[PDB]
Design a protein around this ligand. Structure first.
Ligand code: 3PH
Ligand code: 3PH
Ligand code: LDA
Lengths: 220, 89, 102, 88, 79, 51, 221, 90, 50, 90, 75, 68, 68, 51
């Protein structure tokens, strides 16, 4: 089975795979957005998390598929000759650049650079003048620097989308409360009147299709 | 001695995810079926089961088969094992 | 340029200059990335673009393996007449002792 | 005596187990220890370490309770732990 | 200080496979002996060659067996 | 010095200030070695410096 | 390996490793701070625990790696170093000071003193003089006594940090509730209105940047 | 004793990222292993080496060491990933 | 037993068959107590939440 | 009968921490083992010891005892670790 | 010490002097290799030795295998 | 044992006794043939005992684990 | 393999030599009597060695397989 | 004393107050040993004090 230490490395990677997906792929974002949709509509138990996560997992595959294909053909299909530590190290590293470039496209530079300096640990407490906010790059940061900066960027993006999604439904129910106080009927709660309105508003907008399409379009 | 090879077998472009499965599944089921058949008819032939130079080949063929099927099984199980944890959680 | 490859090759049956002739006949030789070593010995260093390096390493290894089927040590036969002595061994049966001259 | 270290480790875990019954309820009541904050793999590891930090007897000699019905004892200890959780 | 990596002859072995001298010589010696089963000079030769062939074939089988048990034990360690 | 210099990760933590004259580097190097607590070696191709 | 007991001990250690990480490393702290943030924003299931623990473990790697590497090369080192039982037990003990120095540097002096005295009174008897090392060089305390003091110290400081982060959102909530009562809309659940204001507040702060920076700078100068 | 080399100086940690130290460790192990497997295979074919009692006593040790090395690495890596599973899945 | 009779009786098949019973039974007893305490605490937490 | 020594009152007015009890046990075992392995190897190398029935009958007992001791230490250690896992593991 | 050495010793305290007798008879025979009186005695002593050493070694082997089985069933 | 505390003979004795008798004259065929079958029956007894003790403990461990 | 940090071939030549002497005069009773002894000792040496090397391999393997 | 002194951890927990001479240390050390309950040894290179 080729070199067996390469076999061990393959089985190890295969075991860790779900945590890498859970922390370094746009599944992170799609999973959150759909749950916030349910909260904004105010529903407590339906659709099931089984359904929402199934959808999010499917959609994220379309975005990631182009990268896994290239990594596969680069590593496994091509036979290559290599003979020493340095030649192998370089060969292996060069294969990851297809993924590295995606992370650097969606990660925030000053944070990535901070983590790099933190893991060199050199001369530490280097000042803001050691940086000058440069723009165009041929740097190649570590992946152990790139993963957490990515996670922490995706989460913030999700929260931002969740800000806008709440607004229309917030308007919809303050109007209902004001009309009920224009009548005398202040003893009755809005919620049983307000919920169906939100459901029609959402179907008339066809929000699921606009969401899925627009979420995909960001990564094209 | 009668031998044939099929050469124009595979497409190397990026292709829809549905068909990479069918093509992997089919190519693998074919390879294992023919491998198993050749193993059994190497044992049934009296001129091959009794020659020490031939037995040494059959030993390798059997072991390679064992390992290949063990690995395809292991990786497929870990594949569905990922999905079921991401979804349950 | 960052993709340059380099390798060390060792041949047992074929001289460096013999391999050069192969490259020249092939029309594969390239004077920008020539082989470096001792024409008389069997060890050399080569560096260049991936395709050229890979081809060189493979070709040379196969040349060396196939030359395990060739043979150099043809025997020869010399016929040499002795001008001053008998070729065969002799025995002198002394009346008291038998003695041998090989 | 050859097996003495093996038995000495088992006396340790039997003492820790009977201490958990009295320490865990406190971790349930206090607002900085409940499972709204401290959850997953750390939780047991920390509770057990504390219980061993406060057990009153030398850990390497046989636990005295081996002769007693276990349920009445466990309930007794859990009740004591609930009372301490309230007072704290 | 660390021992050197070594350097790998990647291509050589897999296409160094080919008809062994040893089996060829065993069958040739047998064919010489069968022509005159009573010549001591031929018997002495065939005893030696057949013995060497026995040892070689066993050593090889036991080695293939060892190398493949390691791989089966790895896979069974991760599943 | 005319030689590449390699400085240990540990010794690179130390700092210095002032105005310096590199008139005879072998001598200045020997001077500062003891003041700062360094040790150094020269194999013929490069100068290695350690804490 | 050159010796069999040296192998048995290594397999035992590798079997207990995860609990040592769960109870004696900054992971215990990072894991708490992120759950506190999620409580503060009033969320229930998102981000998932698997995502927050993922980043918490990665960040803990940058902080713990140097002493694990140091211990590794210390025990690999091939130079002749020990001869006999006393030299071996001292060699092993000496190899752990790189990590005792860590636990001691972040544990609270008062807790360390409590767990030490309460062990002395178990072994040598409660009549042994209560030390009151109020000005102290704590004489290489036992790691079983030192470890729970670290665990409770990190829980303390993580809770402390988590408290500060609530105060803006607390303000947001009480303000919204007051303006709704000023309009008399007593039947409106504030949470619907106050949730998005919290989200946009946190995004404008850029919380995760500030927070992940400071959490690391607390462990290195 | 025929040909030997050793690597005397290891690069400073102050200039190498955390993942370089891993790539560099992995590569070195994978090569020393492929080289040992090849060496054993070649010893089993030289008819001088395969039939001399002196040389066989060496081959037996070489194959026992290879077996123990790979079993060790394959065990400790499984324990290593099992720790990550325990912390994250839990 | 601390420095009386002798140590290291790894080897006599009659006493070595008596040690097997004890080494097993004490491991089972200790394993059982670990579950009972968890059950008890869990029952208290179940009632107090509900 | 050669060089016998015993400690007295080992626990009568002093008690070790578990932290140290484990460490002393480990050291006292690891060195005895390494010396027994060297003794065996030396009894195999010496041409006068591998060719005399009286000395071979002594070496068979040494190999048997070494093998039984290392197997018993390994089994007990594994079993004792298991119990701590069952305690801590949620 | 140990039980397997106890079993080994239970033979050597059984054959009081054979270990000496054999070497003594050998020295006598070596002094006059052609005396049938000496030869006849040496044949007996040597045979009694060969048998003693074989019975001892096979018994130690069996008790070793009994213990190695029990220590596995400890698991 | 000579001892009972108030509140036949086994294979373990018979083997020790037959070994003891044999070791006095290792070359007598009657004694050898008497010892082969005692050492065999002791080996079988001492295996069967341990294997069944092991089965009863694995049953109880499985019960405790099933109610975890 | 060394335990890191721990402080702390003639019979082959002898057999080769005796073989070379014997091969020159296979009918000498003194060379025959000598070679018989050298060859017998060498045989026993090689066997005892290889059995011991296997016994140590199998103990290391059993240890690993116990925790694996 | 003109010799380095090593005090065991347990013995280091005791406290002493007053005004001392140290004129004849070997005598003084003995006297104090019996009052405090210490035991001590001297190998020729260092003085070891234990509880
Ligand atoms: C959906 C994903 C679940 C299955 C993931 C498959 C991952 C295994 C791929 C692999 O490594 O084996 C390649 C393996 C070897 O191919 P080769 O190495 O390229 O020759 O190819 C296969 O045999 C594919 C087998 C697929 C069987 C699973 C069918 C999926 C579920 C049923 C559909 C409903
Ligand atoms: C709470 C945790 C409490 C204990 C934690 C340590 C776990 C190891 C316990 C293993 C039991 C030893 C049984 C040996 C049986 C025997 O008779 O052999 C004696 C045998 C010889 O006995 P002798 O007659 O005294 O010479 O000596 C040994 O070989 C002892 C084996 C020592 C190996 C211990 C390795 C320590 C690794 C764990 C360190 C991790 C600390 C983290 C704490 C837990 C996580 C929070
Ligand atoms: C509080 C006012 C709610 C009015 C309805 C809001 C829009 C959703 C339902 C009507 C959508 C318009 N449509 C498609 C029927 O023409």
């Amino acid at each position: 089975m080729g070199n067996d230490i390469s076999l061990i490395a393959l089985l190890a990677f295969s075991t860790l795979l779900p945590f890498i997906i859970a922390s370094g792929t746009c599944f992170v974002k799609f999973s959150i957005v759909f749950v916030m949709v349910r909260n904004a509509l105010g529903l407590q138990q339906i659709p099931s998390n089984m359904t929402l996560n199934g959808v999010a997992l499917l959609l994220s595959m379309f975005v990631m598929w182009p990268i896994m294909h290239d990594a596969y053909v680069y590593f496994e299909d091509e036979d290559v000759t290599f003979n020493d530590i340095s030649s192998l190290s370089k060969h292996v590293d060069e294969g990851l650049d297809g993924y590295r470039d995606y992370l650097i496209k969606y990660s925030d530079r000053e944070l990535v650079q901070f983590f790099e300096n933190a893991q060199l640990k050199r001369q530490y407490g280097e000042e803001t003048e050691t940086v000058k906010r440069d723009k165009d790059e041929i740097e190649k940061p570590s992946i152990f620097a790139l993963l957490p900066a990515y996670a922490l960027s995706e989460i913030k993006s999700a929260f931002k989308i969740g800000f806008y999604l709440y607004l229309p439904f917030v308007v919809v129910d303050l109007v209902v409360s004001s009309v009920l106080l224009a009548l005398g009927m202040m003893m009755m709660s809005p919620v049983t009147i307000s919920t169906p309105i939100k459901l029609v508003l959402f179907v008339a907008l066809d929000g699921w299709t606009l969401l899925s399409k627009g979420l995909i379009l960001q990564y094209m | 001695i009668g031998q044939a090879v099929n050469i124009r077998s595979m497409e190397t472009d990026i292709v829809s995810l549905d068909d990479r499965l069918l093509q992997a599944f089919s190519g693998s089921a074919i390879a294992t079926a023919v491998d198993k058949q050749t193993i059994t008819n190497r044992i049934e032939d009296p001129n091959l089961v009794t020659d020490p130079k031939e037995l040494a080949i059959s030993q390798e063929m059997i072991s390679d088969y064992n390992l290949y099927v063990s690995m395809v099984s292991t990786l497929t199980r870990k594949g569905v094992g990922a999905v079921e944890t991401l979804l349950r959680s | 340029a960052s993709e340059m490859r380099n390798a060390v090759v060792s041949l047992r049956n074929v001289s460096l200059n013999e391999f050069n002739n192969f490259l020249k006949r092939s029309g594969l030789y390239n004077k920008n990335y020539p082989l470096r070593g001792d024409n008389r010995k069997g060890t050399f260093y080569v560096s260049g673009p991936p395709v050229y390096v890979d081809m060189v390493v493979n070709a040379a290894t196969m040349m060396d393996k196939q030359n395990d089927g060739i043979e150099l040590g043809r025997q020869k036969i010399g016929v040499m007449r002795l001008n001053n002595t008998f070729v065969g061994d002799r025995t002198y049966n002394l009346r008291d002792q038998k003695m041998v001259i090989p | 005596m050859f097996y003495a270290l093996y038995f000495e480790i088992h006396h340790l875990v039997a003492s820790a187990a009977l201490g958990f019954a009295r320490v865990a309820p406190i971790f349930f009541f206090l607002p900085f220890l409940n499972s709204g904050v401290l959850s997953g793999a750390p939780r047991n590891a920390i509770i057990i370490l504390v219980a061993l930090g406060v057990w009153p007897h030398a850990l390497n000699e046989a636990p005295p309770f081996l002769s007693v019905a276990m349920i009445p004892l466990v309930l007794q200890e859990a009740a004591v732990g609930v009372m301490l959780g309230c007072l704290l | 200080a660390t021992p050197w990596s070594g350097y790998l002859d990647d291509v050589s072995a897999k296409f160094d496979t080919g008809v062994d001298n040893l089996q060829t010589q065993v069958t040739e010696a047998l064919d010489k002996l069968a022509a005159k089963p009573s010549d001591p000079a031929l018997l002495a030769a065939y005893q030696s060659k057949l013995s060497e062939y026995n040892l070689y074939r066993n050593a090889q089988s036991n080695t293939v067996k060892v190398f493949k048990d390691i791989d089966a034990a790895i896979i069974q360690n991760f599943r | 010095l005319k030689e590449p210099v390699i400085v240990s990760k540990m010794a690179a933590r130390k700092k210095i200030t002032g105005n310096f004259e590199f008139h005879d580097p072998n001598a200045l190097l020997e001077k500062l070695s003891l003041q700062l607590g360094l040790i150094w070696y020269f194999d013929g191709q490069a100068i290695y410096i350690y804490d």
